[PDB]
Each structure stands twice: as C-alpha cells, then as structure tokens.
Symmetry: D2
Subunit: 246 residues, 4 copies
C-alpha cells in the first residue's frame, strides 16, 4: 500500500500552518491521523480525509496535562495506540529581551517544551510495549542558531532539540526513535504580517531566497517515520534553504 | 595594591554559596571584581563564605533570594545597586538536577528545573540589561553544561533547560552585538563539587580511586574532573577585555566530552 | 513509487559496501546509475546485473578518482552512455587506523585526496551542466567522524569534517538554483572495512572472539548497539534526491544510531 | 617570572604578520619564549623579532616551507637547539583564495589544503613525542569561523578549516589523559593586512574603490558586531588556552567572531 499505511499519528497543533501540512503529508503516506486544535473545522478535516485514511479531531489545550492525557486516550479508543507523535507548538512572539512579556515567555516555553514532554511521557509506555514508535519534534532553525528579538522562541526550540536527544538515547535499543525537524522560514500568516519586500525578509536569513513549504516539512516527517529511518536517532532534519549552512 | 583586570567591576553570581558558583565568585574576586553572592534562603554559613570571597580585597555581599520568583530576582539586583553600584557582570548559575527516565520524570521537578535553569536567567538578564546599555558595558555569563550541547540518558529536563540557556545566550548576544555588552555561555563537564566528592568517597569505600575512573570513563575522556577553579577561570576570561568580541558562543570545559 | 525516474546518477566507489547500497537504492527509486571503482573486475558484470534487476539503465566505469583526467573521463562516459549527470554521489570509502605520531604520511595524503579533493574535482566537473539544466543533487557521503572526533582516525576525521565544510559552500553557491548539495553522516555500518576494524580489536583484546569484539566496538560509540545498514544510507540518499528535499541545502543527514546525540 | 607562561617555549607558524604575529606577541607578553616563522627570509625579519622581544623573553625566527615535511622538522630541531623543547605549538597558516567552485584553480585548492591542514598534521606529529615525554603540552590550531560554517567562494578554505577542527578533536582525544591539550581558535573577520587585501579586491570589483563601503558590506554580511576582531584578541584566546586554567579544555573551539556563528 503506502509507507505509513495503518500507522496511527497524533499531530498537536495541527489546526493550521505547519502542523496541518504535516498531518496532510502523513495521511497522504497512509497514516490515520488525529488533528488537535466549526464549519471551517469540518472542511479542514474533510480535506485531510481526502487521502483515504481514518481522520479524527480533538480539542485539547496542550498546556493542561489532563487534556493531553484525554487526547491520547481518545486516540487509543478511536484508532488504537499512538504510534507516531508529532509535537508541534506553533506560537511566536517577537520582542527585544528587555521588554519581552513574562507571560509570553512562559507560554512559549510551556507549549514547546513542557507540552512535548508531557505528551511524550504519556505515549512512550505504549510504544515500548508495542516495540515501535516515532516521536517527531517540530523545532526550528531557531533551535540551532539565535535570531534577534526571538529569545523565548530560540530558547524553547533549542530546549526541544535537547529533549529530543535525551528521548532518543533512552530508547536507542528499541524500535522507538525520536528526532527533530528544523524548518527555516515557511510562508504563514505571521510571516506575511511582518512583511516585493519578501525578498528583503528572506535575504537576511535564507540563502535560497524562497520559502520552505509546509509540504516539505511534512515530507521530512514522513521520511523520519519510514522504515529507512529506523536507525536515525536523536538528530535534526534541517529544511531551511541554507540558513544554518552559513 | 596594583589594579587587576576586573578592578572596579560589580558582579552578581546566582547560586554561588557552594560548588561551581562559589568557584566563579572566588575567581572573579581574585581578578578584582566586587561580588554579590546568592542562595535560596539565608544560612548560618553565609558570613564565612562572604569572608572567604572577600579575602581578595574586594567588596563582597550576600543576598538570599529564590531565583524562581521574579520579584526576588529584582530585589537582588536592587540590593546590589544600593550596596555596591550598577550590576556590570551577571553570572546566571543557580541550577538544580534530577535524574530520572522520561516516563517517570516528576512533573514538579521538570517545572523546577526549567524555572531555575532557564527562566530565572531570562528574568535576571532582562533586569540587568537596561543599566548595562546605559553605561555601554556589560557581561552576561550563563553557566550551561555539556548537557546544553549533547544529550544524556535520564537528564531530559536538565538537557532541555541547558540547551535552552545556550539558545537564549545566542539571542542576547545578537541583540547587544554592536555594544560593549557581551553574552556567552560556559559548558562544564563533570565538576568535582562537594556533593560529587561525597559520592566518590562513599563509593570508593564501599566498592573499592577506581570509583572516579568508573564514574568518568563513560563520558569524560580525560578520566579526571573539571574543577570549580577552572570554570571560574573561564568566567574571568569571558569578563576580560580580550573577550570584547567573543559574542554568543560557548566555552566548553569538559575534558573532551563533546569532542567525541 | 519511483521518485527518481528519468534521472542519471553517478556513484563513486560503488562496487562494494555503502556505495553499492546507495546505488542499489537509487536504482530501486528509478534512477539510471553509473557504478565506479578504481580498476575493472571480472565480477563487475555480476554486480552490475544486480543493480539492473530494478529495470533502469546501469553502467560501470573504472576510474582512479585521484586522477582529475579520469574523473573527467567518468563524467564524459556517463554523458555519452546515459546523458547529463544529474545526481552525483561522492563516496570515498577508505580508512586507516593509527595514532597521530605514527600515522603514515602517504595514508594521510591518500585519505585527504580521495575523501575531499576527489569530491571537489567531480563536483567541479558536474556543476556546469546542472546549472545549465537548472537541476541537480550532489550528495557527499561523510561520517559521524565529520562531526566529532575519534581516537586513531585523525586523517579520516579531518577529511570527513572537510567534506562537510565543502558541502556547505557548494550549497551556498547554488542556493538560488534547483541544485542542492548535502552530506549523509553514517555511524558504524557493517561493511568489510568495519569488519576488519572489529577483527583487529578482537585479536588485540578478546582472543579473536568476533561476537564479543563486535559488541564492545559498537557499545563504545553507537547507543543503538546495532549497525546502520547500507540500505539505510541509500534510503537517506533517495530522500535527499527527491523533490521533498528541494529546500534541504548544505546540511547533514546523520544515520548513526544515536552516536552524535550523546 | 610571574607571568602565566613564563619559561614555556612556543613555536608559531606563519607568524611574521597578521594573526600569527598577534599571537606571538601576546604569548611573549604572557612570558613565553617564541620562535617566529615564515616561508622565506625577509629584510623585515629583524624588526619583527624586535617587536616580539619587547616583552623581555627569548625570540628566534626560522624560515621554513611548511609544506615540506623536512623543513617543518628542521623548524622543530632548530627550536630544540636554540631555546629547548617545543612546549606550545601554534599551527597558523593563513593562505586564502576566493573563487566559485567551478573555476577554483586546482593548484590553489591543493596549496590551501596542504598549508591550512596537512602542515598542522606534520608539525603536531613531530612535536607530540617530546610533549608526551615531558607530560605537558599545548597544540593550538588557528581555524576560522569558516571551519564551523560555510561561505560562498571559499570552498577550499572552508574544507581545510573544517578539517583542522576535526584533526583538533582527534589529537585532543588521543592525549586526553595527559598534560597535553589540543584546541582550535576560530576567528571571524580580523583586522589584518590579508583581510584588508580581500576587502580591497571587493572594493575595486564591486564598490568603485570605496574601501569604507566595501568594509561595511563585508562586516554587515557576516559579523553582527559590525566591527573587526583584533589580532590582540586572537592572541588573548591563545594565551587563555595555553594557561593552567585550560588544563581541562580539550578538543574544543574558542570562537572569536563578533557573533558570526551565533546567528
């Protein structure tokens, strides 16, 4: 059939942007998918279901451990065990450090690190029992280098890469792998608001002078979830048009 | 006597009544800096530790503040400003550890490690930067770990927090790059702390020295400990004029851990 | 799902081990492939047959990659036989284990020349056509030893680090084009070379016991306590050559069982 | 006598100008005896020796083609004869050539690899036995930001400097249980005659001869501090790595780059 046929994937933060694109590519590769995050919502789900797999949606606030638990238990009831966990936070706040609001710092750290930790903690026992798993953490180039005015985001994304390494090491002798994807600039509403002058925005950071697409990030997730990635453990797949190469 | 390289600079070291932080405070004072020490709560030992650091002829204070409470961080900075003057060197060091597999890692310990090892550094840096910018000079020295560059089993929260602290260091350095303020991180490997010394003595009596060798062999190719004095020496180097253009980087003091 | 149908690939050092696994996976994905080795072999045919089992056009060409004129001959042979080179896999596959003090000068030079300068020459020779056509993939087979050091592998670590540096520059010089350049960084792969290393360890330390020696050899560096396979390296190559990788540029795909994560 | 490197004997390759001269001067300031080195004898040699000798230590100068292993060995033997055992070896080799990969001349590629990488291997190989016998040593390899990241039109140099960092790690690991350390320093753009030459070439080709404009563009592209690193700062990093506080710094990079690799 298809490379991920039968596999059950959960994508946190899959309502729009990168998370939705990852969900689409996973379903396109054959995975059943749970979208976390209402007529428009039904339209979005139908679009994911166009790839012929079982699609579900859930509305867990990823900052509340009880609701993350409910997301996992919902998936187990509906589709069976969570085999592919994609930790995708999807929030940003741009500010110099001196005026960076404390609550925005806390929110970015909470949703990138602590939420990924709680979801992973809840999913690992089943994956160990079943002898297989994929934890795919959606980091950023900002998890490998710094950028001005993105202190909380760079700290959170660096942290998520560190977490990734530890989870991979603790599972290295199993059928479970944990890795991170590090996208450069992807065309999203936030990036559109910051910005013709697309070229100046890209030229500063992204030598390809073009955007990464949500499809390309999804393709990286599919690769990490494939059998050819069985021995890819604790690493980054950077999809960034050359950002980190310079 | 003669002026030393950091003479006249006021430094604040968090978590500096013992271990690595105390070693850093000692070396900064030896290099001529005034120093404010810090811990979570007042202890009977504060006077003796203050006088140990003050043996090198600089002004030394101690201020107890829970670094997880932004208001107490602010109080530490304001206390330093009132007692000694503007904070010119900030060393973010207070940190805790908890070893556990990810599946059973307690939620409260995860939160504490993130709060102290990463978010407290953010608060203190935010509070010190405006004065540094006004004066045109500063040093922010973040005490990370090898665990901020690589992973280790059963240290998920610590590796996440220390990686995050390195990311933060990069951003602060970039936002200040055209000024006389630098921000950098030091990344120690296994350091011979009093706690580590106790553990080694206990293991060497019970099962044996060779205890040291077994503990270090996995991770630290030198098969020897880093000392708190060496970490302090790295802080003095970053604080010195020769490091005016070292920005956003790591000084790894780890006996070869990250090299392999 | 033959994502490389229509594309012509050249894999250097591809009659054994990792190069052969990469060539096999490229052909399976639909690429026409040119195999290469230093000197021709009577068994070449059999090896070629295996690759051609996947139904693409397969050729073989013997070129000493340390001789620029022979690298040029390989590229011109491919252009005449199959068409323009679209996927270049630079794969050297040589090793010498020794402490620095006694490391032979000739072995140092040979490791630098084949790992690094040969990839430079082949890339030089392939880029004009790929710029003219507007598409290309240059895939450099580095190592974990291009990201970290290991004892007694000074030349190999230097060469593999240098190959990663070269990868970044090529990627930056082509970033606005349809040409990408990236590196794959394998850990320990079970290949005859690594088996020789293990045999040396077994004789020196374990009474010749290859099972004990293999476990000690893997546990030193590779947390998975298992080998990476040549098929896995080839899968990474197919991923880099695919359209999902159009914006993967100047980076490393590390396939190492956790080696660099710790 | 009270300076941190007093009595240590240091060899700095490529040290009659630029970064290497700055390193030699700072080592001497720190109390080290220093051997200077360049490709061929120059009428300016005595004035440079005087510059380094201003700090009251012993200084020598030896001309040696660092691509010739026999001349590297002669440099080491000369030092042993004149000053004593080589205790600090600074492998410094700034040779650069800027070209796109497609037109990069093969002989320039070969030269950059030979000098920026293979010469360091030979010199290290020749110095390690004495350092092992004495139980102390420093091997300080002058890499670059270009050993950690790439830059356009610097394929050979980026490859050579990345290789030198890899070499550094291996040497440090093979000596990790001894008093010998090996580390690399990674400068960004440093204010030196060679870098000014590179900026001038760009100024003529793209900025109408305007050195100010070319310098601003050069720095803005890569170096967030928008200022040069100085040879004195690179030398200060060498003194730090050579000092007792660096006894457990092994196989790492000290990056002095105004923020280049941080972004």
């Amino acid at each position: 059939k298809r490379v991920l046929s039968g596999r059950v994937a959960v994508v946190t933060g899959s309502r729009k942007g990168i998370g939705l694109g990852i969900a689409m590519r996973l379903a396109m590769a054959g995975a059943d998918v749970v979208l976390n995050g209402s007529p428009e919502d039904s339209a979005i789900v139908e679009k994911v279901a166009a790839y012929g797999t079982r699609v579900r949606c859930f509305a867990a606030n990823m900052k509340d451990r009880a609701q993350v638990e409910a997301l996992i238990k919902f998936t187990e009831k509906e589709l069976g065990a969570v085999e592919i966990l994609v930790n995708n936070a999807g929030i940003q706040h741009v500010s110099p450090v001196e005026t960076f609001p404390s609550d925005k710092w806390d929110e970015i750290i909470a949703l990138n690190l602590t939420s990924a930790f709680h979801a992973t903690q809840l999913c690992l026992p089943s994956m160990r029992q079943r002898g297989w798993g994929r934890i795919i953490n959606i980091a950023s180039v900002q998890g490998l280098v710094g950028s001005m005015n993105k202190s909380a985001y760079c700290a959170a994304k660096h942290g998520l890469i560190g977490f990734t390494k530890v989870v991979a090491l603790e599972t290295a002798t199993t059928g479970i792998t944990c890795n991170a994807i590090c996208p450069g600039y992807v065309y999203t509403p936030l990036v559109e608001e910051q910005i013709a002058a697309t070229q100046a925005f890209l030229c500063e950071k992204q030598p390809a002078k073009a955007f990464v697409t949500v499809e390309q990030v999804g393709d990286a997730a599919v690769f990490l979830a494939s059998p050819g990635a069985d021995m890819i453990r604790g690493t980054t797949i950077t999809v960034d048009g050359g950002w980190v190469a310079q």
